[PDB]
Structure formats: structure tokens, C-alpha cells
Ligand binder design. Sequence first.
Ligand SMILES: Nc1ncnc2c1ncn2[C@@H]1O[C@@H]2COP(=O)(O)O[C@H]2[C@H]1O
Ligand SMILES: Nc1ncnc2c1ncn2[C@@H]1O[C@@H]2COP(=O)(O)O[C@H]2[C@H]1O
Length: 246
Amino acid sequence: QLQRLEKSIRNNFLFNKLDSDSKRLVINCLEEKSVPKGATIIKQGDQGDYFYVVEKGTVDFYVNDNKVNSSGPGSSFGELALMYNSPRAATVVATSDCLLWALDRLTFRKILLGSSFKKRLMYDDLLKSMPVLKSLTTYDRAKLADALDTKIYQPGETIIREGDQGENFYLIEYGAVDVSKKGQGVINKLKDHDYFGEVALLNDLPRQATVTATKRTKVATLGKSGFQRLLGPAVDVLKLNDPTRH
Ligand SMILES: Nc1ncnc2c1ncn2[C@@H]1O[C@@H]2COP(=O)(O)O[C@H]2[C@H]1O
Ligand SMILES: Nc1ncnc2c1ncn2[C@@H]1O[C@@H]2COP(=O)(O)O[C@H]2[C@H]1O
């Protein structure tokens, strides 16, 4: 029917949110696929063909044959392979028999990456290129991206001040910054693909130094709650690099 569809959409965060042009342009395209309990829907490593939204049924998610996740009706999956052109990041096994609505790679790139996952698209180069972020899987980079805001600082602007409360952690997209400490002047300098602002957040301390743009500098910024959950791999390197130690 066309009522099951208009309900699919009204209840999906990605879709209820598109303009009726994208919205029309997506109910037209959804193909439905039934699947028996015990069928693999997508295999880890495979090329990404489709995006799925679960009408009825339940799935289990396996990363290297561990099992990591679980979803029911309303939930969607298969979006990372298509937005990024990477292999499948997880195997998705059917846990009870299911009816899935499928968007082909082409329409996904047409409507949904354009608009639902805009952020993931924009930060993808930063996140793939930052050294401290190398251990992150595409699923991780995606969750991290959703949480980032962008700020541009100009020459001579203060980004953070020694002694302040910290709230954000910072990833330099391009630019140049000086780190300074009263009594000591400039003690370090950062640039594209450096990060700063973890010491306050890792240790619950005030900011331990002032950071000042010396060129036009674009950062992505991540709040404390996100720093606590979205950097899982990278977090051990941040504690290991932490200048509050020798
Ligand atoms: N822990 C996880 N790691 C990787 N992918 C996951 C995880 N949990 C759920 N997924 C979803 O499972 C899908 C497997 O295929 P994709 O990489 O295209 O998109 C993936 C996500 O949409
Ligand atoms: N030698 C250093 N001492 C203090 N902070 C530094 C140093 N080098 C780089 N920084 C960065 O400057 C940041 C200032 O705020 P935070 O203390 O939150 O986190 C600090 C580090 O990320």
C-alpha cells in the first residue's frame, strides 16, 4: 500500500525531515524486501548496494563475529557504505522474519546524504585525515561527525584561555595556532590536523594554556559529553599524549 509507506516516512528521523519533493521522490523509489529469520541481509566487507528501513522484524549486528548491536521496527541501517564508498562495517543477521524498505545507492546519494547525513559528508575529509583518529571505523567516524560544529577563527583571536572551565575539544581543519602559558610565552604551536583542548576534559581541570589563532583557522568542536563517548579508539592516545604528564 501507500499508507504503510507514508507511515514508514513519518516515523523515520531521516525521512519525516525531507521536503515533499525529496519525500515524494523517495516513496516512489522504496522497494520492499521480505526476509526469513536467519538470513544475512548484509555481510561485513561487502560493497554497499542499498539502504534499509525496518517496517517489521528485528536484526542483530556483528562486527568481526562478536555482536555489538540490535534493532527493531523503525530502525534503519546500511547507510555508511553508501555515503563513504567503503566496505560494509558490520554483518546484519535477521533475528525474526522482517519486511525492509530499500533505497538503492543512487537515490540515497540523491535525497538522503544530501540532507539527513549532511554533517557526515562535510567532515569526512578532516576525520579520515586526522592522525589521532586513525583507529576509528566508519561507524565511529559517522557518529563523531554528527556531533561536531564548525567555527572559524581569525588572526589574533583567542580560542581558549588558560584558567577557564573547559567544554569543547577541538580538531584543526586548517589554520595555525599558538599555545601559551602566562610566565612562559608560546610553548607549542599546532596546525592542520592537530587537536587541542583534551586536557581539561580528560582530567576535569581548568584549561592549562591559552590557544590563539595566528592564521585564519577552521576547527571542528566536540562537547564534553560527546568527547566522553564518540572518541573511544582515539581516547587512549589522547591520555598517552596528555601534557599533564612526563
Ligand atoms: N557497531 C557497528 N559497527 C559498524 N556498523 C554498524 C554497527 N552497528 C550498526 N551498524 C550498521 O550496520 C550496517 C552495516 O553496513 P554499513 O557499513 O553500510 O552500515 C552499517 C550501519 O548502518
Ligand atoms: N605543553 C602543553 N601544555 C598545556 N597544554 C597544551 C600543551 N601543548 C598543547 N596544549 C593544548 O593546549 C590546550 C589548552 O586547553 P586544555 O588544557 O584543555 O588542553 C591543552 C592542550 O590540548
